[PDB]
Amino acid sequence: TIALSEIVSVVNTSDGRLEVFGVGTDKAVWHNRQMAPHTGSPWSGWSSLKGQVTSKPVVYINTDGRLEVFARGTDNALWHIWQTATNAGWSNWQSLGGVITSNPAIYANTDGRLEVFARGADNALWHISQTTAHSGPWSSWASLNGVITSNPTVHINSDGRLEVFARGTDNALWHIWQTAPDSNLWSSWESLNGIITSDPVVIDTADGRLEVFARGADNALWHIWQTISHSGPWSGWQSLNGVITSAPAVAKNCDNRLEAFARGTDNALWHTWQTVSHSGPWSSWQSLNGVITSAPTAVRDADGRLEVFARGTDNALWLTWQTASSWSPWISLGGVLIDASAIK
Amino acid sequence: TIALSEIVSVVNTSDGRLEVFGVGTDKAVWHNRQMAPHTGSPWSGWSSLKGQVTSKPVVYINTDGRLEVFARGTDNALWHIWQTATNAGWSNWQSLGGVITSNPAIYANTDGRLEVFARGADNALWHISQTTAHSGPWSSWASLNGVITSNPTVHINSDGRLEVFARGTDNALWHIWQTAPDSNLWSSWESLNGIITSDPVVIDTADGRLEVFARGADNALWHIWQTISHSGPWSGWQSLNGVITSAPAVAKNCDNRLEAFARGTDNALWHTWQTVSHSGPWSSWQSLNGVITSAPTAVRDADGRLEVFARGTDNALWLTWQTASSWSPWISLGGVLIDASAIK
Numbered sequence: 034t035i036a037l038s039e040i041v042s043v044v045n046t047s048d049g050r051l052e053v054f055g056v057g058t059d060k061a062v063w064h065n066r067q068m069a070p071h072t073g074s075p076w077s078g079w080s081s082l083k084g085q086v087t088s089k090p091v092v093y094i095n096t097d098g099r100l101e102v103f104a105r106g107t108d109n110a111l112w113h114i115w116q117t118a119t120n121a122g123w124s125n126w127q128s129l130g131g132v133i134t135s136n137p138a139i140y141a142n143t144d145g146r147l148e149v150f151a152r153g154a155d156n157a158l159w160h161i162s163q164t165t166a167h168s169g170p171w172s173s174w175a176s177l178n179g180v181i182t183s184n185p186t187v188h189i190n191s192d193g194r195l196e197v198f199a200r201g202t203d204n205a206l207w208h209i210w211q212t213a214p215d216s217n218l219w220s221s222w223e224s225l226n227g228i229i230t231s232d233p234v235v236i237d238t239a240d241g242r243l244e245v246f247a248r249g250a251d252n253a254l255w256h257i258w259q260t261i262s263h264s265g266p267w268s269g270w271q272s273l274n275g276v277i278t279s280a281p282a283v284a285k286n287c288d289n290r291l292e293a294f295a296r297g298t299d300n301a302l303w304h305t306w307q308t309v310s311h312s313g314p315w316s317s318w319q320s321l322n323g324v325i326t327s328a329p330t331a332v333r334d335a336d337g338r339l340e341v342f343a344r345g346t347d348n349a350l351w352l353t354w355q356t357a358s359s360w361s362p363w364i365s366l367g368g369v370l371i372d373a374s375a376i377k
Numbered sequence: 378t379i380a381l382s383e384i385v386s387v388v389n390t391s392d393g394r395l396e397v398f399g400v401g402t403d404k405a406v407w408h409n410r411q412m413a414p415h416t417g418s419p420w421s422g423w424s425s426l427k428g429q430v431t432s433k434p435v436v437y438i439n440t441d442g443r444l445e446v447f448a449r450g451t452d453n454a455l456w457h458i459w460q461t462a463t464n465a466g467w468s469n470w471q472s473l474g475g476v477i478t479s480n481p482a483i484y485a486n487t488d489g490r491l492e493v494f495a496r497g498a499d500n501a502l503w504h505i506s507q508t509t510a511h512s513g514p515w516s517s518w519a520s521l522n523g524v525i526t527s528n529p530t531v532h533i534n535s536d537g538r539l540e541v542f543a544r545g546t547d548n549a550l551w552h553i554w555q556t557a558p559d560s561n562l563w564s565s566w567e568s569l570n571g572i573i574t575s576d577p578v579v580i581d582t583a584d585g586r587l588e589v590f591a592r593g594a595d596n597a598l599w600h601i602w603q604t605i606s607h608s609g610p611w612s613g614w615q616s617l618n619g620v621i622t623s624a625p626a627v628a629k630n631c632d633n634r635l636e637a638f639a640r641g642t643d644n645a646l647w648h649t650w651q652t653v654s655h656s657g658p659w660s661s662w663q664s665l666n667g668v669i670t671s672a673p674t675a676v677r678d679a680d681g682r683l684e685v686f687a688r689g690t691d692n693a694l695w696l697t698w699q700t701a702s703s704w705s706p707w708i709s710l711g712g713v714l715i716d717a718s719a720i721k
């Protein structure tokens with residue numbers, strides 16, 4: 034078991050527009066797009082990419098600007114679908130094979146090859162990559178071993194090395210990393226201790242450090258971080274308090290101040306943020322209202338403003354964004370979304 | 378002849394710190410570094426990377442976070458020097474051969490291979506690239522032909538294709554582009570007309586469009602841009618007025634509003650900026666004071682604030698940055714810098 038997942042995958046397109054991806058009642062992937070690269074842009078309305086999926090669908094942008102979506106299929110293999118040219122039409126769904134037991138997780142190597150991570154049937158971490166920059170065909174699968182109990186998350190260190198985080202068998206945060214950029218050589222798994230009750234979330238700070246956020250045993254928001262740029266060792270676990278009922282989401286303001294979001298016990302959206310600068314201390318928690326039925330999803334738009342998505346009481350996706358004064362009122366983007374997360 | 382050049386090359390390191398590179402009286406490359414990734418950080422003071430150079434030295438950051446500096450040597454070959462690991466020590470200077478007659482210009486392909494452009498002895502555009510991501514050895518040289526009369530500038534389109542701009546024999550802005558990302562296949566040269574009297578400057582907008590700035594025949598600041606994301610055709614040339622005595626410099630605010638900087642006729646620093654948003658109209662010109670003896674160099678720091686560098690009356694580098702209210706007073710970073718630009 035883990036805290037309630039995010040309901041969509043969001044990305045900033047090559048032309049600065051937000052685009053969201055989720056799963057409908059029919060089990061198809063659906064997406065909604067800003068028309069314009071500005072806060073409060075009108076949206077396309079939902080449109081189907083078809084397929085039948087049994088995980089959260091996860092969008093990542095290739096280094097040539099083409100979006101690509103990954104999802105577990107009905108046969109448990111990894112499936113994907115991609116734009117044929119940047120912000121143009123999409124391929125058919127195509128299988129990358131294997132058998133997976135988590136949502137896929139994706140990052141670009143420094144050489145432009147996408148690399149995908151997901152839990153296997155043996156509960157270990159497996160991975161597969163593009164054989165050349167932003168293109169098929171793909172390598173064969175291999176395992177990075179471990180035994181994990183949450184969806185994995187990947188990021189890149191400030192020196193190019195990929196690094197994966199997941200909950201272990203003891204409910205601690207564990208991790209593993211490339212020993213060189215683009216490499217097929219990885220470290221051993223290592224533990225960062227704690228006890229966590231959500232999927233870990235990872236982000237890179239302005240100063241080139243991986244920082245991880247997760248829900249603890251007391252249902253407060255905890256985090257932990259690399260102490261120096263791309264370098265071990267890590268800090269201790271520190272709490273950011275609150276009581277939260279969903280997974281957390283994290284984004285950088287336009288000044289690189291980190292801001293965390295989560296569903297509270299009153300089932301409203303709550304957030305806490307670094308004050309002053311990106312090395313500053315965190316605010317106390319404060320409410321953005323709404324009643325919501327998924328973890329929030331946060332992203333920075335092309336006006337440098339944070340925008341947050343969450344499923345509503347009507348199962349539609351709803352949206353609120355930063356203004357000069359405070360935040361916008363909640364507005365509805367329609368649709369009816371389900372949580373297809375492979376691990377719940 | 379062209380407007381007075383920028384005196385330094387600036388970059389944002391992998392850990393969010395500004396770092397500047399210039400040329401001293403001895404013809405060595407010297408650099409100065411922020412200690413901390415914040416506006417108003419103290420600086421290292423100047424420190425020598427040695428070498429003897431006969432162009433402006435140009436720093437670019439590899440996709441593994443390692444800085445690499447390019448400069449024409451005393452034998453007219455292209456020379457370079459690189460960090461052996463991210464923000465660690467530097468290699469020795471090493472020659473990439475050839476004979477060049479401009480400052481080098483650099484960009485990363487979507488596959489992580491750096492590619493360098495520079496004018497040849499035949500006055501054509503030549504280029505050379507890393508054979509693999511963020512690493513030597515390098516390809517052999519080849520020409521993209523043309524005949525050009527300014528330092529070239531390269532950027533990347535929002536679909537991964539590199540594109541180079543330079544002044545032609547008729548003093549118009551001309552350009553050429555990859556037909557596919559990472560490719561060795563390029564278009565023919567094409568003209569964007571106008572008459573320009575500075576090196577062209579190029580930047581990508583929040584909405585994935587290349588936008589070019591240059592000084593015109595009337596010594597006003599002009600610009601021109603792609604009309605749709607990564608797509609021809611371009612707009613017409615439009616003027617931003619002012620009277621300017623150096624090359625322009627351009628940077629994005631943390632909200633992606635573009636901001637242009639130049640030396641005025643009173644030899645102070647002047648700037649004009651998009652108002653409201655990144656699709657908004659440009660302000661009237663306004664003074665940041667100082668008396669300065671080089672074009673300004675502008676960059677956004679890790680607090681999302683613009684910082685501007687320019688050589689002073691004492692030949693030292695001076696620095697002013699955005700605040701809440703207005704801008705900081707000019708402060709001195711010491712040193713004695715010369716303009717080693719291969720084209721003046």
Ligand SMILES: CC(=O)N[C@@H]1[C@@H](O)[C@H](O[C@@H]2O[C@H](CO)[C@H](O)[C@H](O)[C@H]2O[C@@H]2O[C@@H](C)[C@@H](O)[C@@H](O)[C@@H]2O)[C@@H](CO)O[C@H]1O
Pocket residue numbers: 082083084085086105106107108112125126127
């Ligand atoms: C290159 C090519 O033709 N690929 C085929 C896929 O397009 C096929 O997948 C399915 O496509 C149809 C429309 O033609 C529709 O989108 C289906 O929902 C989709 O199949 C489902 O969704 C996938 C993601 C998997 O879960 C699959 O097992 C589901 O049946 C498949 C045939 O299904 O074959 C490819 O060759």
Ligand SMILES: CC(=O)N[C@@H]1[C@@H](O)[C@H](O[C@@H]2O[C@H](CO)[C@H](O)[C@H](O)[C@H]2O[C@@H]2O[C@@H](C)[C@@H](O)[C@@H](O)[C@@H]2O)[C@@H](CO)O[C@H]1O
Pocket residue numbers: 177178179180181200201202203207221222223224
């Ligand atoms: C630095 C170091 O050696 N750390 C040890 C880890 O490598 C160990 O993890 C396990 O390693 C073996 C290979 O020797 C294999 O990969 C296991 O699957 C892996 O352990 C599992 O996965 C972890 C993420 C946890 O969930 C763990 O509870 C699983 O048993 C561990 C094993 O005790 O010790 C480290 O000190």
Ligand SMILES: CC(=O)N[C@@H]1[C@@H](O)[C@H](O[C@@H]2O[C@H](CO)[C@H](O)[C@H](O)[C@H]2O[C@@H]2O[C@@H](C)[C@@H](O)[C@@H](O)[C@@H]2O)[C@@H](CO)O[C@H]1O
Pocket residue numbers: 321322323324325344345346347351362363364365
């Ligand atoms: C554009 C517009 O008029 N939007 C209205 C929303 O602001 C309303 O949402 C609700 O706002 C109140 C405070 O004014 C409070 O934040 C509520 O919790 C919130 O509504 C709930 O949360 C939403 C995210 C959904 O789950 C919704 O079903 C809940 O009722 C809505 C009221 O639905 O009206 C809009 O017109």
Ligand SMILES: CC(=O)N[C@@H]1[C@@H](O)[C@H](O[C@@H]2O[C@H](CO)[C@H](O)[C@H](O)[C@H]2O[C@@H]2O[C@@H](C)[C@@H](O)[C@@H](O)[C@@H]2O)[C@@H](CO)O[C@H]1O
Pocket residue numbers: 426427428429430449450451452456469470471
């Ligand atoms: C791998 C290796 O040993 N490379 C040699 C370079 O380091 C040499 O260059 C020069 O290095 C010395 C210190 O040893 C000092 O920095 C000199 O200023 C520098 O040479 C000058 O600057 C270069 C950029 C060129 O302009 C060069 O022609 C100048 O003489 C050179 C020998 O000069 O050989 C390499 O093999």
Ligand SMILES: CC(=O)N[C@@H]1[C@@H](O)[C@H](O[C@@H]2O[C@H](CO)[C@H](O)[C@H](O)[C@H]2O[C@@H]2O[C@@H](C)[C@@H](O)[C@@H](O)[C@@H]2O)[C@@H](CO)O[C@H]1O
Pocket residue numbers: 521522523524525544545546547551565566567568
């Ligand atoms: C679309 C198209 O065909 N445009 C023409 C350009 O390709 C031409 O430029 C020249 O092309 C030849 C190869 O056929 C060669 O590369 C020349 O060096 C190049 O012209 C020179 O470089 C330019 C940047 C200008 O400086 C020009 O004045 C030089 O003579 C031109 C040539 O007239 O016409 C375009 O229509």
Ligand SMILES: CC(=O)N[C@@H]1[C@@H](O)[C@H](O[C@@H]2O[C@H](CO)[C@H](O)[C@H](O)[C@H]2O[C@@H]2O[C@@H](C)[C@@H](O)[C@@H](O)[C@@H]2O)[C@@H](CO)O[C@H]1O
Pocket residue numbers: 665666667668669688689690691695706707708709
């Ligand atoms: C930290 C501090 O006290 N800085 C002082 C600077 O603000 C001073 O610079 C000058 O400021 C005035 C307005 O107050 C005006 O902007 C001048 O044009 C500017 O000084 C000139 O421009 C500089 C960039 C240099 O070229 C300098 O040689 C010129 O005199 C300076 C005065 O030198 O004092 C600092 O202490």
Ligand code: NA
Pocket residue numbers: 138139186187188235
């Ligand atoms: Na990730």
Ligand code: NA
Pocket residue numbers: 482483530531532579
């Ligand atoms: Na450039």
